[PDB]
Structure formats: structure tokens, C-alpha cells
Design a protein around this ligand. Structure first.
Ligand SMILES: COc1cc(-c2cn(C)c(=O)c3cnccc23)c(OC)cc1CN(C)C
Length: 123
């Protein structure tokens, strides 16, 4: 498995815009709570899950635990950087798994909530 994604941005200002505050305290908070969040809260272990070619098809692994850490410890420069990671997480799932998979049905319910909160992004 690839090393876990970087979650610290050491030489960077400790300033969170209100949109990034929204991404943590509304978007992430609500998604993290969701019933189907648990398959997405940690990096995919392609070995233990026996996912052939997962890291061949998936060039940018991403997960909600990484996003949570990055939001919590000031990694993102701006909101769109964070929104892109959420999208990457959902994209990875949709391009690797099949439309009938439980994991895809769960991702779609999770993404519905994501999109709803993003539709209400302030400013
Ligand atoms: C963390 O453990 C799990 C991960 C996943 C999981 C997540 N993502 C994002 C995937 O793409 C994915 C792709 N294929 C197979 C599995 C997963 C999971 O699928 C419902 C179940 C568990 C529970 N386990 C005790 C088997």
C-alpha cells in the first residue's frame, strides 16, 4: 500500500476561511456521522480487501480520514482544494467498483449528502 497521504502542511499560515470552516464543521462533520461513512474513513487497504489493480486504476488515493485530518490541522489553502479531495474520494470508488456494488450504493447515498451541503456553501 502507498504511504498515507500527507495531512500536515508545515510551512503554511494558520488561517481558515469561512468556507473551509464550513467544510470541516458542516460538510465533514455531517458526512463523518453518516451511516455509510465507515468504508470511507480510512485509506483503502488494497491488500487486505483483495482489490486487484486498485492502485493501478486509482492514481490519487483519498479517504475521509485524510480529509478530516487535513481540515483539522490547517492543510488546505482554500475550500476548492478540499472539495477536490472529497470528489477524488467519490471518483475513486465509482471508477474502480461496479454500479451494482454495495460500496457504490453507499457512496451514492453519501455523495447525495455531500452535494446537498456543497449546494449551500456560503460566500
Ligand atoms: C474498511 O473495511 C472495509 C472497506 C470497504 C471498502 C471501501 N472502499 C472505499 C472501497 O472502494 C472498497 C472496494 N472494494 C471492497 C471494499 C471497499 C468495504 O466495502 C463495503 C468494507 C469494509 C469492511 N471490511 C470488514 C471488509
Amino acid at each position: 500500500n502507498p504511504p498515507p497521504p500527507e495531512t500536515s502542511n508545515p510551512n503554511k499560515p494558520k488561517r481558515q476561511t469561512n468556507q473551509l470552516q464550513y467544510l470541516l464543521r458542516v460538510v465533514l462533520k455531517t458526512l463523518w456521522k453518516h451511516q455509510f461513512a465507515w468504508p470511507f474513513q480510512q485509506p483503502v487497504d488494497a491488500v487486505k480487501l483483495n482489490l486487484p489493480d486498485y492502485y493501478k486504476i486509482i492514481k490519487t488515493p483519498m479517504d475521509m480520514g485524510t480529509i478530516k485530518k487535513r481540515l483539522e490541522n490547517n492543510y488546505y489553502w482554500n475550500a476548492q482544494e478540499c472539495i477536490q479531495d472529497f470528489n477524488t474520494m467519490f471518483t475513486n470508488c465509482y471508477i474502480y467498483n461496479k454500479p451494482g456494488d454495495d460500496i457504490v450504493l453507499m457512496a451514492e447515498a453519501l455523495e447525495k449528502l455531500f452535494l446537498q451541503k456543497i449546494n449551500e456553501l456560503p460566500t
